Structures are given as C-alpha cells and as structure tokens.
Amino acid sequence: GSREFKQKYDYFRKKLKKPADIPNRFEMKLHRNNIFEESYRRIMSVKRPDVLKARLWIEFEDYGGVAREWFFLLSKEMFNPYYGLFEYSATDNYTLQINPNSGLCNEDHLSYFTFIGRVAGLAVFHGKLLDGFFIRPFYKMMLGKQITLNDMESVDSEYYNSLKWILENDPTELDLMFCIDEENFGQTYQVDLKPNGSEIMVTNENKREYIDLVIQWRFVNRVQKQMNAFLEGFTELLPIDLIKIFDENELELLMCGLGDVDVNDWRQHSIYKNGYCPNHPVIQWFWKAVLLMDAEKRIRLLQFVTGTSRVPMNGFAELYGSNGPQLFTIEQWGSPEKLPRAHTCFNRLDLPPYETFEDLREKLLMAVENAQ
Amino acid sequence: HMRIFVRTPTRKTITLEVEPSDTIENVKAKIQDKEGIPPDQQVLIFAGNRLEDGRTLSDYNIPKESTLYLFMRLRGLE
C-alpha cells in the first residue's frame, strides 16, 4: 500500500520513547570476522535492554555509516542457515523459516533467537533495516494472527493446491488420517495431528479441521519456543501494541525493507561479453524483461545467476563472485532453441541470441524455474 | 571403501572418502579441508543424533553412502 504505511509510520516514530536515564551512547568494538558472536555477547550481557535505545557508536578494528554496515553484516550471519537457527522454507525457496530442530543444532538457540529479536527491534527503533527474507507467516505470527490455508500458497503452492482440493472435493478416495509424515535429518516419523490422529479418518465433515491442523503443524506448533523468544527480544525495545498498528505486509517492510531489486542499478553496473552491448537488441530485451517481472521473479533471477538472493549493501557495483569483485555478466552463448545457463561462482549468464523479445522472456523464465 | 555425504544448510552436498575406523574428529578434519571450518566449530548430526568427536562412524552404525548433516556451532555466554 505504502501510502498508509507512511502515515502510520510517522505516528509510530513519534510515539517511540528514548528514556532519559541511559548513557547517550551505546558503544561496540567488533571484528568483522567474528561479528555474530561478539555482537551477541555485547548485547545479551547488558543489564538493561533500554540502553540499546541510545545512539549507536560502533567500531570495526562516520558512525551512522558504520552502523549501516553493522546492520547489514550482522544480518548475513543472523540469517545464515549454517547455524541452524533458520532454514530455507523449501528446496526451491529463498525465504527462511525457523528451524524446528534448532535446539538439537545448538542448545543455546533460545538465547540467540532473543538476541536476533533484540537486534531487529533495535534496527526498527533507530529507523534502520535488517537484510533478509522470511516466509510471510513469520510476520503474521509476530502479530498473533491465525495462520490459514491461504498462507501456505506463497511458501508451498503445490501443497496449497493439494489442501485446496481437499477443501473443495470429497476426500474419501484419498484415505487420509489425521497422521502426517514428518521428515527430520532424512528420517520419516508419523505424527498425530491431534490425539489419536492416525485412527481418525478425514471426512467431508472434519476436513476443515484437518486442513487447519496441517497448517498449524507446517508453520506454528514446532517453533513456538523459538518464536516466543524472538518476540521477547523484539518487544524488549518496542511495545507490542504499538507494533500491532501494522499489518503483516507493513511489518515486513518496517523490519526487512523492500524485498526487490533495483533494475537500474543492476543494469548500470553489468558487463557484457562476446558481442553484447548496452544497446544491442537482445540485451535491451533482457532488461525490458527484468523490468516487467515482479519481485519474486527478479529475486529468483538474481539467485539463478549469482547463487544468492542478497543484493550487495552498496548495490551491484560491489558484486562479488568466488574470487573477489565480479560484476554481473551476460555473454553470448548457444542457439535460440537453448535455454540460458548460469555460472553462479562468476555471476555469469549464458544468454542465446533469441530473435524476439517474447521468446527471450519465456526462455529466461523457464530457465529460472528449471534451476532447482 | 567407502563414501559418505555431508549436507550443509546452505544447499551444498560435500562428498567425503572415509572408513568406519574414522573418528568423528577425523571426519570433521576432512570437512575443514574442503570447507574452511575449524572442527570445533562443526556440529555433525546423523539420524537425530549429535556425533561426539571421540566416537567413530562404525560406533554410530553409519553405513556406506550415508548422509550426515552439518551445522556451525554457537558458543553462548560462557
């Protein structure tokens, strides 16, 4: 909407209060190569969370500029799935969800979720942003809103259609029970969706309850302690009822920002090889196609060609490959019956010289879906 | 002779050459070579179980062509 976001937002900021009895600065000295654990110890050791509300003075090894760098660099670690706190929401998604097994991965996980909540609340309090993509139900769960069948669609559209089919048709032929196969670390477990579930049969009369229980199992039930710890840290800087003037789309914008790629900055810093030029026709068709796609598609295209969903903090001028700087590169390759190819370690798109715009567009889209 | 797989949460499957004699500590050393991660900063999991550095692949009944799950450690407040 964005028009209503700005009105609410100005109201929101005016209501936020800096207490008068805290130091006028919150100092951190950090090493970039240990940014996560150091920011964690510093921030989780304070006696009084409200001191986080002061001006941030941060040094690695302009203060507002170092603070920007800190928010960005710390987001890359806080939202790094290697630590097992968050995980990709599907094999073909760039969005993150809470790992229900985060506890097995690291026994201190709740303290880190609380920390990440604190940093997120701290970004917002200071009018700054973290950098990352969470699944939409995460923001609904922050607001206490019920998660529903329609919420499944942006995460897993096939499972969404499967459950919508059940809603709209007689499911008897399916022989379903209130059992569900849960997979953890390659192994499959049967879990009851409700007590005695595997011996309760899904029928036209109870299938709505079944669908709801599947949704709760998918997104809610297994991550409550982690989500609750995140919210503890998030509300330690921001009152919850103040937060709740925002809907879930607005909350994401407030926390994690736009979620889209600047096509202009992208274009104005790409390199072309083997015939291609800024005004060559195939190239103009490429950037016209990129303009016409939505956010999800621009992000999936970025991921397809660079291996990551994240745009560099200072835009595409500072894009990196595997061996230092590496601008986005499109080079002529193959023949128009070919789908384009990507070399992620070097941010390179192998793009056939298609004959029409429409053909490039369908072939570019198809290559993107076809990658995982 | 034998081969195992290590899946990272960053959508990467590492191939290792090992034998059942190998300690978890030694498997982690191979991972550090291929990946840059100090063994003490590694968490390996198989079938819902954290793997202790001292025990061996054989000890955990890890057959040929198995997949282990790797994660980076968080140290907490100490």
Side-chain angles (χ1 to χ4, degrees):
Chain A
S2 45
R3 143 78 170 173
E4 289 191 338
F5 173 81
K6 196 234 195 63
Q7 302 190 285
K8 280 177 181 184
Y9 180 78
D10 291 345
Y11 171 82
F12 171 76
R13 299 286 265 125
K14 266 164 204 150
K15 296 301 245 205
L16 290 177
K17 293 308 178 184
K18 190 167 251 151
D21 59 10
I22 59 180
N24 292 338
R25 314 149 106 221
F26 187 83
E27 330 194 35
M28 311 180 60
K29 309 200 224 104
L30 309 167
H31 310 84
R32 291 192 178 85
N33 59 24
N34 201 32
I35 188 175
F36 195 3
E37 295 285 16
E38 291 178 2
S39 312
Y40 166 75
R41 296 190 217 106
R42 176 73 170 105
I43 283 168
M44 295 307 285
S45 293
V46 304
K47 294 178 183 171
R48 185 184 178 206
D50 277 340
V51 305
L52 296 170
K53 297 178 155 140
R55 172 119 64 212
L56 304 177
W57 280 39
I58 296 168
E59 292 179 355
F60 295 104
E61 304 132 18
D62 186 18
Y63 274 119
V66 189
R68 187 175 93 106
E69 183 184 19
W70 175 69
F71 277 123
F72 187 88
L73 285 182
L74 183 53
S75 295
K76 292 177 63 155
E77 283 287 84
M78 296 185 306
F79 307 146
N80 190 345
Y82 225 128
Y83 295 101
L85 301 179
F86 298 100
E87 72 180 357
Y88 291 117
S89 56
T91 54
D92 48 12
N93 286 347
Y94 54 88
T95 51
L96 296 175
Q97 66 192 15
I98 294 168
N99 181 18
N101 294 308
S102 58
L104 185 61
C105 294
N106 274 282
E107 336 186 356
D108 299 312
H109 68 309
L110 298 193
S111 165
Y112 282 87
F113 281 110
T114 293
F115 163 69
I116 294 174
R118 254 138 91 143
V119 173
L122 164 74
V124 171
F125 187 94
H126 283 94
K128 303 310 188 74
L129 307 164
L130 305 184
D131 193 280
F133 296 98
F134 285 173
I135 57 169
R136 310 246 264 273
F138 184 90
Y139 300 99
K140 292 191 68 174
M141 278 166 69
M142 293 189 61
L143 293 165
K145 301 181 162 203
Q146 180 185 72
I147 310 303
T148 65
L149 175 51
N150 290 122
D151 292 320
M152 172 81 75
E153 185 181 10
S154 71
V155 182
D156 187 346
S157 55
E158 292 179 59
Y159 203 19
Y160 162 82
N161 290 317
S162 173
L163 299 171
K164 198 176 70 178
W165 191 93
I166 286 169
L167 183 64
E168 294 174 1
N169 301 266
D170 187 344
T172 308
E173 63 178 64
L174 297 177
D175 296 300
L176 294 173
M177 304 283 139
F178 284 56
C179 143
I180 193 55
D181 285 336
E182 186 179 287
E183 173 265 312
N184 305 278
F185 308 106
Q187 303 196 297
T188 301
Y189 309 79
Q190 305 141 309
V191 347
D192 288 329
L193 294 173
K194 69 183 291 184
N196 300 134
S198 66
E199 295 183 9
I200 305 179
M201 183 185 250
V202 175
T203 66
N204 279 333
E205 284 65 39
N206 63 21
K207 57 180 182 183
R208 284 172 179 79
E209 188 200 352
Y210 170 79
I211 292 175
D212 181 69
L213 292 172
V214 168
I215 300 297
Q216 302 314 296
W217 162 87
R218 178 52 180 84
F219 297 117
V220 180
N221 292 346
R222 309 171 61 194
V223 299
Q224 275 307 119
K225 297 163 61 177
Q226 300 95 321
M227 181 67 61
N228 286 345
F230 171 87
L231 276 172
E232 289 180 28
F234 193 78
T235 56
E236 255 163 345
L237 284 103
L238 306 173
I240 190 63
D241 285 327
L242 197 50
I243 287 301
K244 282 196 198 203
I245 68 176
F246 292 117
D247 70 33
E248 59 270 22
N249 178 70
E250 292 169 330
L251 187 53
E252 175 171 16
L253 282 171
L254 175 81
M255 294 172 64
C256 256
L258 309 149
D260 214 322
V261 187
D262 184 332
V263 173
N264 310 277
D265 169 65
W266 196 354
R267 178 184 21 102
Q268 297 150 346
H269 291 96
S270 313
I271 291 322
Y272 320 95
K273 293 233 174 311
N274 199 27
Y276 286 153
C277 338
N279 309 283
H280 176 309
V282 169
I283 292 312
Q284 291 195 136
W285 287 341
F286 175 82
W287 294 112
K288 168 171 161 85
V290 170
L291 168 68
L292 302 188
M293 33 187 57
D294 62 9
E296 174 177 11
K297 269 155 195 144
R298 282 183 195 140
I299 301 287
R300 296 189 123 99
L301 171 59
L302 177 63
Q303 159 114 46
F304 174 65
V305 182
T306 73
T308 176
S309 59
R310 183 168 283 116
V311 166
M313 177 189 159
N314 292 328
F316 283 91
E318 306 188 341
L319 194 67
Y320 273 57
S322 291
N323 316 311
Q326 183 62 265
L327 295 185
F328 190 87
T329 300
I330 308 176
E331 103 179 342
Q332 189 165 354
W333 166 95
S335 53
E337 85 287 349
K338 277 326 186 340
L339 289 182
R341 288 188 330 194
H343 304 282
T344 46
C345 294
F346 311 79
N347 304 335
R348 190 170 74 247
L349 174 73
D350 289 335
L351 184 66
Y354 304 98
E355 270 136 10
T356 63
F357 159 78
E358 309 64 3
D359 202 49
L360 179 144
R361 186 168 149 159
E362 326 171 36
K363 250 110 178 189
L364 186 56
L365 267 49
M366 213 174 312
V368 162
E369 153 48 53
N370 288 1
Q372 203 43 60
Chain B
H1 219 224
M2 68 169 274
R3 181 199 280 129
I4 62 176
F5 303 105
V6 177
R7 181 134 191 92
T8 82
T10 63
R11 237 106 63 147
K12 194 176 177 192
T13 294
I14 307 169
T15 304
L16 290 191
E17 211 190 353
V18 296
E19 287 211 331
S21 328
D22 290 325
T23 59
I24 298 309
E25 173 172 26
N26 276 347
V27 167
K28 292 189 177 177
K30 306 189 166 177
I31 286 158
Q32 175 198 44
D33 285 340
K34 274 181 191 291
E35 217 67 20
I37 306 170
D40 54 295
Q41 296 289 205
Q42 300 186 25
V43 174
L44 282 170
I45 286 169
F46 178 71
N49 295 308
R50 296 174 65 100
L51 310 179
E52 279 156 12
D53 286 336
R55 300 240 276 173
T56 74
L57 290 174
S58 204
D59 294 20
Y60 283 110
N61 298 297
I62 293 174
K64 168 177 49 91
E65 309 271 322
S66 266
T67 304
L68 283 42
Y69 291 84
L70 176 62
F71 295 89
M72 287 180 66
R73 158 183 180 213
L74 302 165
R75 13 196 63 200
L77 304 176
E78 317 186 44

